Amino acid sequence: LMTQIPVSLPVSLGDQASISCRSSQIIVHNNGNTYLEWYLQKPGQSPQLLIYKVSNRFSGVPDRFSGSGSGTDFTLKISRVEAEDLGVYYCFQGSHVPFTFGSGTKLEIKRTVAAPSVFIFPPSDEQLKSGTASVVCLLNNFYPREAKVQWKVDNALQSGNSQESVTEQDSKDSTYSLSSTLTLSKADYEKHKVYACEVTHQGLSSPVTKSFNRGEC
């Protein structure tokens, strides 16, 4: 089997990174080399091959990636981390059955702090008529990932009718985005005019709030 450490790996561009794996038993086939491989699953895509047979770079992989290892420990090294390299890496062993994968190591690009562009989207009539109206608050492109989102209906802290959807890091600028939806039934929503979404972020000194005035037409 396999053990992959570390789980998370914050790295700055240009930095070097090392991800290692330890198979339960010494991994070797018909002495036909150790069949240990490394995969990169970029976000929103299928995994791809980087190195196979411990250190052979698959066609198309840039030389910033290299593999090594002995007996039971193998390591993947990235000499200069570039933006395109973010995603989850997996080691894999094909020398023994069952063929096993490592749990994965998520590589995240350390970037300069950025503030989220908060947004509030009140429910459009088309869902209001249907009943359940949801007010979505968007925290666009920020970093780090630490972000608190609290709901203030008029001044009530809605500790229930909300959920969060956080994206993976974006290779265009290494940021994240988050969405919180306050899902209300026509009545509850209808009962109050103003709805506020309060954001607190590391690059955000004074927690910004985002509110609107309820309406109809």
Partner: protein, 219 residues
């Protein structure tokens, strides 16, 4: 160019049966050992099966041994995975892969086909809009989108102007609401100046319920 295409998965109930297939293109199918790999919701990756070129040599991990059967039709360059007695744990993304004569397992991966295993009921999504009336126009750029509410099973594909709006698109991953229904938002940010001329439309698609919805978003 070389590529693999998996197809044939959807919602099947516990104890049921499904047969996923994979179509080869760009290489001599009959010369290669083929594989079936799966990724669970928690993003765990697992090997499912392999089959020799002739079709006489195959193997599977104990977890799927006996319920699954891998087959291939060299005539039509397709690879099949017969799944029987499905369990909920079998819920995952199934990929087919091709290796290298050189000594590599998965050099070529397909796109994957999602197999959901539950007693739930297929339900189409309600493509709602997100109006950027005023509390969003921060200047010369604002965000907007379509809220794809209440649907099952996954997945739901969203597009903007049928692919004529790539950069700027922020489609968030689905959240399993309380109702046992998924919900997700696809937002995009555009220059306030673009509004009007730039006709913005999101094309939602929930194949599992033959739902093909389009929605024009505006100021």
């Amino acid at each position: 160019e070389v590529n693999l295409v998996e197809s044939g998965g959807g919602l099947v109930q516990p104890g049921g049966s499904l047969k996923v297939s994979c179509v080869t293109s760009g290489f001599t199918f009959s010369d290669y050992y083929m594989y079936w790999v799966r990724q669970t919701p928690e993003k765990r990756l697992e090997w499912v099966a392999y089959i020799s070129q002739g079709g006489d040599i195959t193997d599977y991990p104990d977890t799927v041994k006996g319920r699954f059967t891998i087959s291939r039709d060299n005539a039509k360059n397709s690879l099949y995975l017969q799944m029987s007695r499905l369990k909920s744990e079998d819920t995952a993304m199934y990929y087919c892969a091709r290796g290298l004569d050189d000594g590599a397992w998965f050099a070529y991966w397909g796109q994957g086909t999602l197999v959901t295993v539950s007693v739930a009921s297929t339900k189409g999504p309600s493509v709602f809009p997100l109006a950027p009336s005023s509390k969003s126009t921060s200047g010369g750029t604002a965000a907007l989108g379509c809220l794809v509410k209440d649907y099952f099973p996954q997945p739901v594909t969203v597009s903007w102007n049928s692919g004529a709006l790539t950069s700027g698109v922020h489609t968030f991953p689905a959240v399993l609401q309380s109702s046992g229904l998924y919900s997700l938002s696809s937002v995009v940010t555009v220059p306030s100046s673009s509004l009007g001329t730039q006709t913005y439309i999101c094309n939602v698609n929930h194949k599992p319920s033959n739902t093909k919805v389009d929605k024009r978003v505006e100021p």
